[PDB]
């Protein structure tokens, strides 16, 4: 590789995307990791690890999904604002802009949820709480199965040790996916994505010397993101088919509305 006009342009694109990402997304990976590693003086979340601690911290499934979707409107808007900053995006056919975002937002929301997760649990209530993974897994069916696949993904994705400057480019690559169904004009999308992929490959070489094949490993994570999104349909089918009791403590319903 050489430092030439093309590589300098790819670094400028990376910086433009990082600056727009910081402007668009108040909750960054750096802020979430500072909380989760105890490297902050200011925020100490309450830990919810069992029914007792749940109380000390003071249709059901469909209500959860309606609630978390409503709570995720702000994220959808932030991702849309970010997309407008990707060079070329707003010049695409408007039908295609909507198609790219309507598929991409779910994958992006799961990518960013991983920043809030470690092997032990997930930040909730705007960083003020931490809900454990094994407590979520212990809840009665179908609830106890909702989040575990996301934790399995997050552990593997977080093992790549990406930072916010890496994530800004990766999220742009997700948005500019020429494979989405119903796209009218695939070539101009792939033209932008090719530029974004070049910028991502250079970013990961410069930022991760000790990683082998990080670019390929990161692109392969898109398979896991897609699987989780695709499985949401099956989860709705499981709910309708569940004949057992699906009551759930009101505070747990509120916690799940903060997830996805």
């Amino acid at each position: 590789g050489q430092l030439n006009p093309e590589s300098a342009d790819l670094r400028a694109l990376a910086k433009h995307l990082y600056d727009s990402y910081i402007k668009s997304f108040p909750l960054t990976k750096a802020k979430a990791r500072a909380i989760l590693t105890g490297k902050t003086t200011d925020k100490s979340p309450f830990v919810i690890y069992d029914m007792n601690s749940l109380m000390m911290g003071e249709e059901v499934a469909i209500r959860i999904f309606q609630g978390c979707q409503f709570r995720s409107v702000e994220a959808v808007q932030e991702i849309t604002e970010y997309a407008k900053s990707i060079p070329g995006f707003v010049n695409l056919d408007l039908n295609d802009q909507v198609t790219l975002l309507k598929y991409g937002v779910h994958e992006i929301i799961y990518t960013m949820l991983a920043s809030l997760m470690n092997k032990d649990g997930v930040l909730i209530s705007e960083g003020q709480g931490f809900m454990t993974r094994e407590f979520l897994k212990s809840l009665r069916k179908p609830f106890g199965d909702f989040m575990e696949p996301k934790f399995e993904f997050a552990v593997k994705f977080n093992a790549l040790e990406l930072d916010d400057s890496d994530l800004a480019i990766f999220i742009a690559v997700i948005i500019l996916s020429g494979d989405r169904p119903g796209l009218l004009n695939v070539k101009p999308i792939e033209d932008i994505q090719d530029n974004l992929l070049q910028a991502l490959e250079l970013q990961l070489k410069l930022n991760h010397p000790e990683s082998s094949q990080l670019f390929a490993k990161l692109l392969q994570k898109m398979t896991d993101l897609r699987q989780i999104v695709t499985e949401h349909v099956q989860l709705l089918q499981v709910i309708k088919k569940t004949e057992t009791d699906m009551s759930l403590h009101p505070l747990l319903q509120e916690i799940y509305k903060d997830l996805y």
Partner: peptide, 13 residues
């Protein structure tokens, strides 16, 4: 998910 499409379309305006 027409609700989601409407959110995105409005946010693009």
């Amino acid at each position: 998910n027409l609700g989601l499409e409407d959110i995105i379309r409005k946010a693009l305006m």
